[model samples]
Target: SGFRKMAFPSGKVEGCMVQVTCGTTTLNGLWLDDVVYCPRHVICTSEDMLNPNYEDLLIRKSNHNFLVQAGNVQLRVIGHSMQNCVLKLKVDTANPKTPKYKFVRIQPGQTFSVLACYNGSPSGVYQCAMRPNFTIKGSFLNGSCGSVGFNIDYDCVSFCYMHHMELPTGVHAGTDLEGNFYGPFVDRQTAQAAGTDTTITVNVLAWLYAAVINGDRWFLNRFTTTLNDFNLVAMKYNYEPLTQDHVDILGPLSAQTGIAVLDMCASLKELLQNGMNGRTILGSALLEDEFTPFDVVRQC
Candidate 1:
């Protein structure tokens, strides 16, 4: 019989039941959604998951990010206390009447990898986003779906740059284009200009990201960005912009439609809380022209 496997530690749940099983002659490993009030089924697999064939978790497409998947996509969890270890997700489907999708939250010492986009069209698609600090060491899994969508779209580019640029850890010193450095490096008056410049850059990118999303799709175009592009490799991938589909749906709006970039659980400030939180909206143009407060405020 199939059994459920629980990666969650004890006390991580309030009204949830947890179970654990190993990969043995009967079962490979069971993947259970890290949700409470959910049913569970664990299947047995004689296949040695450590084998090379099991490593085929990657699903690739010609122009999109790669993804890794498991047919029975079991989520990961690790904790000692706090029954609050339930997994949450920021679903793009924000229709509340339909259970509206949102982000998730992981325990402070616990972690999980988030599979962000999964497209099954002309080409299959898959990618993981908002992985934790421990590091993502997972492969792909697919059924008869072929190589449509199963990959691990690591934030490699962004992470790598953050390393080189030396992101601030302790003190909050202003950073250069590299996003490193702590404590103001320049004089007071002169530094104020830099702060202003930072604000402008933040507003610009935020607005640009918003402009890319249209009715229900995201449109992506070619752009040469000096920043992380975040994993946008300047290598074999040709420095293409990711999340084109997301942009397509969110772009071409009344200049009032705002957008947000999210991590796995899609927790508001749980992941990256930079300019992500704001009550102000920049104009559609870089210089400034009009306002769409009604539209923006209405939707938000």
Candidate 2:
């Protein structure tokens, strides 16, 4: 079974020693390497650890231990006054002789998070020590009573490319005949000449009013009922050059409704070429679709 495969291999039972001394009590344990013992605490050598139960584990436990590769750790003080408390974190870097250190002043009821990334080393070890200006009494260090404690949360993260493409602004036009709708824009002359000219030009505002504003089913049946679907419609219709009237209507509508007319075609095209190229199932599927909704067709 997959679970058995992830279990510790035979005779590979090495462990890391962890020691924590607080007040009169000291915690001593051997965190077994390559063994998945604690559900709330995890040890990893790479940033690729993707534990779906991470949040649930956090909810179930007050404290966590994570040995990660270039990640973030959050520490929160609990149970005692934080006015005079401070947390000191030490990281064992690539140069074993020299370690990096950081100190954070504790604020009452506030959690502090720190990014623990040592570009010098892919994998790093972190040690956190809590210090308080007050004296420790009784078994206070054991998290019993009148004692200050800390909760630790850690996870690995990677930088993501944020898209900054601006949405289309100004008045736009669209038309519908029967159940099928066409356009997002047509020339002002073409729009005015609709009834008299060979083609019929339906105002995009009218279509939006009847289909979207009035809560009608016209848009739902034609294009699936999702913001992404509507974005696809806009992207598809953008093939026709926008006219002044189209800009006039679309600009205000975009401002009021907060609907974005994104260039999904170029966006997806760039994504396919750069980020997703032959990487996953989405890459292949998006390539098959050519980066556009299959149902979206340019009317003009």
Candidate 3:
């Protein structure tokens, strides 16, 4: 996923863009080639920020080693100081000559996760390349604890440091996840530049489908954000088309779905208030025949 420069809460704050009379960075850029373990001449594109001819794109890669049978790897953090904090995760893809890893950021509330890891050799040692997503909040730069350097072999296992709990996502997970229900949005230019990058559509659909099925509000917010981000890109060129599809997809996730975000919220909120898991909240799949839920139309 492309990194977001930053995201505002409302998605689009009226005239919220901060103008730059003077640029910030030096060789400044967002490139896929500048990253790591780059496939080859044909596999990736040149980093547009630089020479556009310089093949350094920001395409980061994960590291892996071929190994012989392993089952799984689970990682978690435990520290009183970190109870209220967010943890960021990064993988040093074995780009020995270079270091770049496509990042995944998790929510602070997400305690830990189990990842599928398997070993299939008699050496009983095999290193798999890739790291799990960790919780993050704000932005990230060159120096971050979430920023790490690593080397891995099949038999080597590693852990992360537990520091302050309340840090931004960029510092923790190497991802800046301020307002990305849709995905990351660095700028409108990137969106338009991303034309035909079907991955953009896929990103939008991932959040949309998950939120629709589970009625997850954060996911919904992100789903809309991706739309608005694209919409903003369209607006830059007076191109106000195709954006409605975003809203159309969200209609069911809204109150119109007749899902009673209110009722569900109240019940779910109570569970949260009682220190219960919201995921365990039970909502009835069946409403009365007169239920005219807005999404009933969508269901058909």
lDDT of each: 0.21, 0.22, 0.23
Tens digit of per-residue lDDT, candidate 2, span 1-300: 000001111111111223322222222211222211111112111231233233443344322233322223222212211111111113232212211222123321111121121111112221111111111111111111111112232221111100001112211121110111122222122221112111001122322322222232222211112334433443444322223444344344334334332222233324323544344331122222111110011110
Which prediction has the highest lDDT against the true structure? 3
Q: Which digits, one per residue and each the tens of the lDDT, describe model 3 over residues 1-300?
A: 221111112211111111101012111111112121110111122343222221222223111210100113111111111011221112222112222323243322112111111111111111111111233332223211112212222322121211111222222222222212112222111211111211122222322333345554431221122444444443443332234543454345544444333333332223223433333211322111111222223232
Cα lDDT for residue 273, model 1?
A: 28
Residue-pair clashes per candidate? 56, 12, 35
Roughly what TM-score does model 3 have, to 2 decimal places?
A: 0.20
Q: Pairing residues by index, what is the TM-score of model 1?
A: 0.19
Question: RMSD in Å for candidate 2, one decimal?
Answer: 25.3
Q: Per-prediction RMSD in angstroms?
A: 21.3, 25.3, 19.9
The order of the candidates by lDDT, greatest first, is: 3, 2, 1
